[PDB]
Amino acid sequence: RLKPRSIHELSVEQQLYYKEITEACVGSCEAKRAEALQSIATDPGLYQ
Amino acid sequence: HELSVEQQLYYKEITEACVGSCEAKRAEALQSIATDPGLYQ
Amino acid sequence: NPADNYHLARRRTLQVVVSSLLTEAGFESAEKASVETLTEMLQSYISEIGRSAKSYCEHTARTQPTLSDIVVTLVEMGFNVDTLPAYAKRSQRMVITAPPVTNQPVTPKALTAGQNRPHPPHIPSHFPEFPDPHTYIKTPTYREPVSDYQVLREKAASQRRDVERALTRFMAKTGETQSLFKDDVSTFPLIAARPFTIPYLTALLPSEL
Amino acid sequence: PWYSIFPIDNEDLVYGRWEDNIIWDAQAMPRLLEPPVLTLDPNDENLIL
Numbered sequence A: 001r002l003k004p005r006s007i008h009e010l011s012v013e014q015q016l017y018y019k020e021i022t023e024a025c026v027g028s029c030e031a032k033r034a035e036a037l038q039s040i041a042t043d044p045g046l047y048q
Numbered sequence B: 001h002e003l004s005v006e007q008q009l010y011y012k013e014i015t016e017a018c019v020g021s022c023e024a025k026r027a028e029a030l031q032s033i034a035t036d037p038g039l040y041q
Numbered sequence C: 001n002p003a004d005n006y007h008l009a010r011r012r013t014l015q016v017v018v019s020s021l022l023t024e025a026g027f028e029s030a031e032k033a034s035v036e037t038l039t040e041m042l043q044s045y046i047s048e049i050g051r052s053a054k055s056y057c058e059h060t061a062r063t064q065p066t067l068s069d070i071v072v073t074l075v076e077m078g079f080n081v082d083t084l085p086a087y088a089k090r091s092q093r094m095v096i097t098a099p100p101v102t103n104q105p106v107t108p109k110a111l112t113a114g115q116n117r118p119h120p121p122h123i124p125s126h127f128p129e130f131p132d133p134h135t136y137i138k139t140p141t142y143r144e145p146v147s148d149y150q151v152l153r154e155k156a157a158s159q160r161r162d163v164e165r166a167l168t169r170f171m172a173k174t175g176e177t178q179s180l181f182k183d184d185v186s187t188f189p190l191i192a193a194r195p196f197t198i199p200y201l202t203a204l205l206p207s208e209l
Numbered sequence D: 001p002w003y004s005i006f007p008i009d010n011e012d013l014v015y016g017r018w019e020d021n022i023i024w025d026a027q028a029m030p031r032l033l034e035p036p037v038l039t040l041d042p043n044d045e046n047l048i049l
Helices: A012-024 A030-042 B005-017 B023-034 C005-021 C032-059 C081-088 C149-173 C199-204
Strands: none
Touching: A012 A030, B005 B023, B005 C149, B023 C149, C005 C032
């Protein structure tokens, strides 16, 4: 008996989004930061 | 999946060393459990 | 609250107008109920030339009222219109400022720019675009599988070597031991050789069959 | 990414109510427990199969 291969609770848009927002929030470019900061400030689905 | 005879024997000796026949074998079994590298599986 | 400010921006402008008209050759420090009375008669007066001069022009098949529609509207309210050029040229005449605008910034939003997805052919292009993936897109995801024969051979080999080393060190430490060097028990311990009664049995006999 | 830049966690620990296997009173076991079969989860690496 092998338990089923589980899936991460984030979608692959959510990991890509998370990866883009975190790589923008380390501030290589300032306009990228500022949008990523506004995206953090008003994304409704940023829970989970 | 299927314990091999080596680790089946190791499991048997380590579990029966911690049932209470003597204290010294118990201390060496607990010092085996605490300080071995490959006890996964 | 911008909901009641739709009405209170223009009714509290009419309160400054009555407060400016009761000061011109007149009062200071009026009663409170006497100001909300007079600014209610002022709003009801502008709303009555609105409804009646529109009615007098639309009776004459027109849509916007001229001067001849208001000088008949004010006659039907008993105004004596001729005294109005003398009232407009006062030296006490004052101007009350118009109310402020809620959207002072006008355009203060950086916004959030996200585009994904197109339109099915029953939705034309002028409807808003479909939103991003996080809004409604879910795919399961799994852990990275290591199907490599080299690292699987290495893992099985090292685990077998480590478990047999652990087993032989445990059995040499908890029994009689021999050593090639002097008092050498920590490094290279040998399980001591124990003779049997029937050595051929332990020997020839297969153990896995 | 192709898979995930996110680590896979034990679904049983993260989600299951393991609290229901705690034995608060031996005599008053509110539910009847059953023998557990070995399930050999393959999500864990370091296991050949």
